[PDB]
Write a protein that binds this DNA or RNA. Sequence first.
RNA 1: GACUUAAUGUCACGGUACCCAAUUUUCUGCCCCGG
Length: 1271
Amino acid sequence: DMNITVELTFFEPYRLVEWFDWDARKKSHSAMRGQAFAQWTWKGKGRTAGKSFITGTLVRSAVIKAVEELLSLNNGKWEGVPCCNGSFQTDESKGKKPSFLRKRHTLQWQANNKNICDKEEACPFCILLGRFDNAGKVHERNKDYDIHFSNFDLDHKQEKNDLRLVDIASGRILNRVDFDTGKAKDYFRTWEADYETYGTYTGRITLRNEHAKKLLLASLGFVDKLCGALCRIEVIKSEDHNDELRKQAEVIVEAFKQNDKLEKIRILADAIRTLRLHGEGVIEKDELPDGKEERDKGHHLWDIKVQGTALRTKLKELWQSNKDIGWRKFTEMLGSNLYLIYKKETGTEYYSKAHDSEGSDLFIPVTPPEGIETKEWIIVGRLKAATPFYFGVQQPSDSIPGKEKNEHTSFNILLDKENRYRIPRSALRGALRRDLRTAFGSGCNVSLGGQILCNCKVCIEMRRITLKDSVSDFSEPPEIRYRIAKNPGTATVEDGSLFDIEVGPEGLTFPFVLRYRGHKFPEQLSSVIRYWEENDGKNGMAWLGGLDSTGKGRFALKDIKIFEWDLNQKINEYIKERGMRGKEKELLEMGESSLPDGLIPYKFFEERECLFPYKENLKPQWSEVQYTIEVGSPLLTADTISALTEPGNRDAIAYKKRVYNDGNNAIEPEPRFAVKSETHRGIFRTAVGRRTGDLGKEDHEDCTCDMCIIFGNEHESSKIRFEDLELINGNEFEKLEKHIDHVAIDRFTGGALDKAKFDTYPLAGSPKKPLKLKGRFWIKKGFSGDHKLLITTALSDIRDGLYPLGSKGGVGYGWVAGISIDDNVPDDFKEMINPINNDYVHPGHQSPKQDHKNKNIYYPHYFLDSGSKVYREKDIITHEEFTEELLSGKINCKLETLTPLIIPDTSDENGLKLQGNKPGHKNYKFFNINGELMIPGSELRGMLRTHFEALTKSCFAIFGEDSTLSWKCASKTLGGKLDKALHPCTGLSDGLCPGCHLFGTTDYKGRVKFGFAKYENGPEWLITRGNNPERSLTLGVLESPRPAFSIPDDESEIPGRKFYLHHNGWRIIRQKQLEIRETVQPERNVTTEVMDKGNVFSFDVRFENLREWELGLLLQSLDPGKNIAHKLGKGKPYGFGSVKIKIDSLHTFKINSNNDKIKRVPQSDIREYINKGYQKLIEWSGNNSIQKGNVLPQWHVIPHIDKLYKLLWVPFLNDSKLEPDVRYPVLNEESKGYIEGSDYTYKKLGDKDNLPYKTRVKGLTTPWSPWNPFQ
RNA sequence: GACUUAAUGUCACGGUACCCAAUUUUCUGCCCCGG
Ligand SMILES: [Zn+2]
Ligand SMILES: [Zn+2]
Ligand SMILES: [Zn+2]
Ligand SMILES: [Zn+2]
């Protein structure tokens, strides 16, 4: 008649449910599913606090199962006393049914006890069950119980007032995933409780018989699992912060709304979250980025005024008032509040069905054979992340335990209470179920409402496997990864399509415990373990987690050890050592001499090459394709959040990662550069969908097209999985990142647009030192020949260079030069992977042709005036497919310098090292990446775009409107002086001009791409004798262009575009270098290196989906004939920078045809293309008087082409005697270098006495007209 | 103690928060007349 005080300790997070009695339980679903959990009852009016307990019937059922298993292991005999096989049935007519009904099978044995159990003398099993006693099924009192299990209360160490549910539990949503489609069918909710603080329960067991006492104390140690967690049973003797931060976030959102800058709030939200990865000093020591050289606007977003103050000072005064909650929680709370306010402003469940019907109430005895041996195996090891991982969870403030009742774009990761990463038990068990079903070949879909247990092989083996949840030793914050969408018609982004996820680092380690109780170790479980384990040669293939299409959640199994318990002979040592539950960490570090007795190492573990479920069902499941991209251009994959946080006022930086190391225990100090898996997943998807023509469909629900079979949709998972492209040779570079700055040039003034300068920081890729990125993807088994051909054609299209990586690909960034494929790829993928002259001589102007003694003086820039008519096409050519009637290919071109050329590297303003003395003197070098002279692609693109726009009467694409003239003030601004048709194109509703249709706009991608030019041949470095380097001429003064000379009254609107003349005026700069370096201030001059005439550069132009006349006009704009050339670079009024482009080759491909080939496009078809372009220009003019035939075209029959080609005429080309004199005037008769009695000042060309304003505009409009003796 | 179980019968270690979506489109580091 003695009592036993028992203590129950958990080692995993257990499950919690609400308490109802018996009938309110049947009214509910979550309570009926939630039996055999830990119950929770409320306390007091209002549902905030209560207490948790575990009922005595649950502990009774666990002990009864343990007694039955222990008596089955010893054939119905414990410590030499025999016992019968109990009773587990109740007749319905005599008494009621016992409130819980068994569906599982009960173990039996042969009764060899030689008696029959009655009230007087009973076996130990019948005493422990409670058959022959009083108080059955209707409770009266605690006495007349032979064995009594009391309730188990939470042994709260700090039980002072109450326990809140949000302090013990945390809600979570589980899932059910179909095997074939990979999509969810239904979901349900649970409550998981903490075990480190609230995991000890205490209770009392009362007994009135000692024959039961020996077996009961033996069987309390064999209970291994209760309420969803591994257990051990022993016998002993800040809402105010959220409210204040919510009101402050409302103030921030309204202040952004008043400036009409609401869309930035989303950006700002994640920026604050990224601030958890740096210290608090980035707010305390004002290390946030500032803007460029403009005091007015300040920064792009950190200087938006909120209640009269900037955002950085508001952040400082908010952090100064919430110092107690820590830095990380402060940043997360502010970011989550801003995201929820933005989402508010912008704007199924299945539990196991009831069985109250006929059904079945059966009894299934199973008696195992006598000579069997039952053993228990334990596998211990570590799990190491090979990729980033993601374990999804619901949003906080949507999963709060007490209250449960527009899709989100932000997603979070699963963490513990101490902010540690967590592989839950359910995810590991689901992945083990999936791989075991693949290993067996056949299994069932899981049925929930069941009266008979499933008899498939997977469900047989999964009822003997016990796992354990894992947590790491890492607490550092996650990273945020971003994804967008792309409109396939315009090749731009779609608004409202941005979303982000939270990922953890690669290299992290987690513990791993598995237990299996049975008669023999299965072949299929060992095959799955060997499929998960990594060795030399083989990599791991454990796909846990939930973003596997992007390659997130590939783990490996390191350091496996398998131990074995013999339960038929050493059951007492198992009972004593409690199965090493909770001490599995010590098994990995124990030697073989310190093991407990009864646990031996298991040496008959099957090797990889002898397992038969391996090599037939698991290894051919996924096939690997590894490759190496060789990129010979600057590569820029933008970050857009790191640029807002790291100090150094950069605009676009490259993408980085964080990799955890395991030799030491911290993250690696230097980060790794990579191209994300999402980016080249989208590259492959667009590359397949353009050739098959499936991107044009507007809907993809209930589809079965090719890109929905390979890449999946909303109803099936993908058969192709991508990984990142990491840089492998970024250590043989010096200064891997390179600073490149660009600007926009106004078309009327010829100078830079005010505040349009931007800068990029791409990685230094050169054609003689290229970047090498290593990548890999996985293909599922079951692919046909056509789908393999589609993927291989996409790989060959990446290799040929149609899809550049990253941003700014139209100006030459991220051009793939090659692809190499290693020897481990299967043989099908390896075997499927493996003069022009224009001859058009323009008759030049007769005024610098009839003089021929060089006495005239001309003006160095003139203006072109095509009047008002622009043609805006409303049917835009789309990027969705490769159309059959259109053209696509590449042009290889060469560039030759007729005059010296200056292309500066404007990063360093002291690169020739001359500012030690003469401080404030800008001096530059030539443009180079890694010591190789290059010309950027943006310069060539802007030159050709200005020529194409002036040829075809296009709009002014880059134009300054806010500036106002003043001579006396003025009337409306110089944006209002322009005609309405010449304004820049905005939107696709009103159409597009020819220049904006070919080269692009903000809402439509261009169809031409210009590459970087490389130097290859000829001399270099025009040498001057007396100079501090032998290179590096010192230039003159290059002052800002003044538009008041061309509009000299309130009338007389804008005189068109501005072009410069070709002359050898650099000779007089080269001669008087001593006159230049003395007597002009060094803050006004620029010193820079020059290249001589005769150097050859080479570059490529790439185009897709062009009509015939567009390619004709492009080939005409590249090489417009003899005696016509272009202007490029610095110092164009002084004569520097005349280039001539020769077309070396033209290739055109047609990939909608039978075979994808590359032609050579002979001379006859090129002449036909230029002729078609000329006929299109005549049709746009309207003059039908010019006949149609096979005559070589005379472009000077159109007036504006004649003016344009007079402006670009090179007179000194064919070794003729003439070279004109081109120079600006010199203010007054005393200024600098006046020439006696020439009268070439601005004092005489300025007033309305020597020439009125009309003839001045007349002289600035007509090309090459002499200005000395004025005519 | 009660709050808070019923007792000859609890496979909820009977269920992967899973699935689809390229941070990108456009822009020549350029340039002479007065205060
Ligand atoms: Zn008995
Ligand atoms: Zn099954
Ligand atoms: Zn489809
Ligand atoms: Zn336009």
